[PDB]
Ligand binder design. Structure first.
Ligand SMILES: *Cc1c(COP(=O)(O)O)cnc(C)c1O
Ligand SMILES: *Cc1c(COP(=O)(O)O)cnc(C)c1O
Lengths: 445, 446
């Protein structure tokens, strides 16, 4: 089949039009290896999406593939017992590897992983409320928590990465807070921002939980936590089994040991092959030079993209960790147009602007993507001058602050609107009808 | 590592939930398995009658499934930058052809996420708030609370305990607010006509009827309860779907599935291709003539043998249900568990909740090995535990059967004052509530 034939069959039977077809490049991948993907007609592309961050080492990494296929073929996949030898070896490796990890439990998705983290924190502390910043998954309570404010029906207060807000919330009602769960954003904030968050939480005896489902292997080889941010729980997911479905919740012994009373479970949590894969992933990441080489390829790409944009006079900001750097542009139309055009030149750029190199990249792969980016940017600017300021200026502070709010719900201003939101939210929590709680297990009533 | 005591100690230190992972399970850990048989860390062999807690339908390391999934992983890849793939479309095409309610189908990793998707899609498609529920749907709080009769305003879920009188009165009183009805079929106490009547009541109120077949999908029949002729607007599948590999599916009416975009559902691993290749192979095996019927013959052989063993010892019992998911109901909730713990000594993993699960890989030798173990174990427990092992013959009491239904799956089967008060009280609670207080919904409805 070709692209058109497959999408018409897909529209009839499985595809969500925007999520699966129109929001994505007009190709469907047939096979992929290392940094390179091949579509249904044999066209080749360098992937800069990391399979939407699922992949960290590269496609069909042979050590991961060997580990998973050996488990599937020589032992089995999902057994009548929930414990397995690879589960215990993986748990031991992760507990040795991570300062916060005293025990670790597993699941299939990051959405379920962060749900487990919140469920365990509530079960361990017996407290109702959770303070949240960042995407944690597609459940309603997670999505609503990305917006600043309190939802009494879920017991979640979004605080928009705002440290003034977090401090005032903990002072006003910290005794009701089971946990603070934060997806680290490290373009607009530095590590000290999260160190201060963690310290604030400890001051109030409130578990601090890092949702590293995205950052776990791209902020560094041991995530933001490993760069020196203390935490009581860390959730991992994207990259953990290099594309195979696995997530992990690791943290303080008493929080993890709330598993029984919490009622968490799941048929496939015990699934063994992806645990063998993750063990292989850790071994690769801890091989001398491998992660450093990956970051060097990310820097080569970021530096090249920054200079192409600046050379076109396009106001831009390219920054963040080498394996998850953001390309911030003056408006939300220019990037998508450039990235759509670059698909014609053999690259899958990440259309949201966070580019994701993998460990399989070499200089040739990076330079192929840079050549495509230069030609695509040139074509878009020549064809659509209105799309792009080309005067050589810098991004306005207004654009940078607006982008933070739009992109991840970050409330970075100290203005009248933001402070009014803080006041409104604290008053709504403190003044609420305490007889009305979310449904919790175990009950807190 | 090497033996059971070593592994559980290492697990307690780093990963194990004490009850769920260790003390609530038999004292062995499986190292490898094939067909109907499992081998533990010390090389002891066991016939599995738990179906890997229902994850497995064909048997361990089934060759066609192994080949399909290994080929995808090794020769193509696992999770691509595109969410569409050739195996995804071929699997969806097969499922749409295979099932009457399937006009489109979308995938996820777990049945818990699958049923959450079904409710999310029904709400997004109808723009309505409330969901009526019966049965286990997963481990989220709204799912677990919905197993109890009653209404939780913070989740928008009303549990109705499989009760048709309750369902009809709820739809009459506030059905215009009901986005969907989601029911996990219980087919020991109820027949198919019970669920046909549910589905018919829902259709009269333009309320989507959704079968949660994460458990029943391949064990009530090769096409589940739905395929036995129970109309539905959505069916959720999961256990068995990829013969142990993690995959779930939500299939159903075009307009409900096409609410995906506005619903906000997503997930990194929904697109994962190897388990879809495995599911394609599972359907091919299940649809191979003779395979499912042989599985049902083995289930009947086991069920008949267990019934004869219990009756031969004078133990009142009820053995019934579909051949691939039959229940062994006893006069108390301790006897079965003690027998099954003892039978582990004799090389069988019985399902400790009493619902025994053969797989397509069973032969007469595997069944009869389980039966001999069950006979030895029953005789030993009868001899040692007269406190829980009555041998005077007879049948289970009606009170025991009614109590068991309520405790096992929240079924309100009694037509008494207490039950009808609960129905009226719950309906009054819904109808008279403060309508300004809604759960968090996406898309927003207030
Ligand atoms: C991707 C993501 C999740 C959700 O993980 P899924 O496997 O897609 O359900 C949760 N948190 C963060 C920070 C993520 O990036
Ligand atoms: C097991 C089960 C679920 C949940 O499936 P998981 O994959 O374990 O999350 C949902 N509904 C029913 C009827 C089930 O038996």
């Amino acid at each position: 089949m070709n692209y058109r034939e497959l999408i018409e069959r897909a529209r009839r039977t499985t595809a969500a039009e925007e999520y699966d077809i129109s929001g994505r490049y007009p190709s469907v991948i047939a096979h992929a290896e290392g940094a390179w993907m091949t579509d249904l007609s044999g066209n080749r592309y360098v992937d800069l999406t990391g399979a939407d961050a699922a992949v960290i080492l590269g496609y069909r990494h042979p050590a991961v593939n060997e580990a998973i296929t050996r488990q599937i073929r020589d032992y089995g996949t999902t057994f009548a017992s929930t414990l397995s030898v690879p589960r215990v070896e993986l748990a031991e490796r992760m507990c040795e590897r991570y300062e916060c990890a005293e025990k670790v439990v597993f699941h299939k998705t990051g959405t379920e992983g962060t749900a487990m983290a919140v469920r365990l924190a509530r079960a361990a502390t017996g407290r109702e409320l959770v303070l949240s910043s960042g995407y944690h998954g597609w459940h309603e309570w997670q999505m609503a928590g990305e917006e600043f404010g309190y939802q009494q029906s879920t017991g979640v207060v979004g605080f928009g990465y705002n440290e003034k807000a977090l401090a005032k919330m903990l002072e006003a009602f910290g005794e009701q807070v089971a946990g603070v769960i934060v997806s680290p954003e490290v373009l607009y904030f530095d590590l000290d921002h999260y160190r201060r968050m963690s310290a604030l939480c400890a001051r109030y005896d409130v578990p601090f939980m890092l949702d590293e489902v995205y950052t776990g292997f791209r902020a560094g080889p041991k995530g933001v936590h490993g760069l020196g941010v203390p935490a009581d729980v860390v959730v991992l997911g994207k990259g953990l089994a290099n594309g195979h479905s696995l997530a992990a919740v690791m943290g303080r012994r008493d929080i993890i040991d709330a598993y029984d009373v919490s009622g968490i479970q799941g048929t496939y949590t015990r699934e063994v092959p992806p645990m063998a894969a993750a063990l292989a992933v850790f071994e690769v990441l801890d091989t001398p030079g491998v992660y450093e080489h990956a970051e060097a390829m990310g820097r080569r790409l970021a530096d090249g993209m920054r200079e192409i944009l600046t050379g076109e006079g396009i106001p831009n900001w390219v920054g963040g960790p080498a394996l998850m750097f953001d390309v911030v542009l003056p408006n939300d139309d220019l990037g998508w147009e450039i990235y759509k055009t670059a698909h014609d030149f053999g690259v899958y750029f990440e259309d949201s602007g966070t580019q994701l190199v993998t460990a399989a990249f070499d200089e040739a792969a990076v330079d192929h993507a840079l050549t495509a980016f230069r030609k695509a940017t040139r074509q878009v600017v020549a064809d659509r001058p209105d799309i792009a300021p080309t005067s050589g200026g810098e991004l306005t502070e207004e654009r940078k602050l607006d982008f933070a709010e739009e992109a991840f719900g970050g409330l970075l201003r100290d203005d009248e609107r933001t402070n009014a939101l803080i006041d409104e939210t604290i008053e709504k929590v403190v003044n609420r009808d305490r007889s009305i709680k979310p449904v919790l297990f175990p009950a807190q009533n």
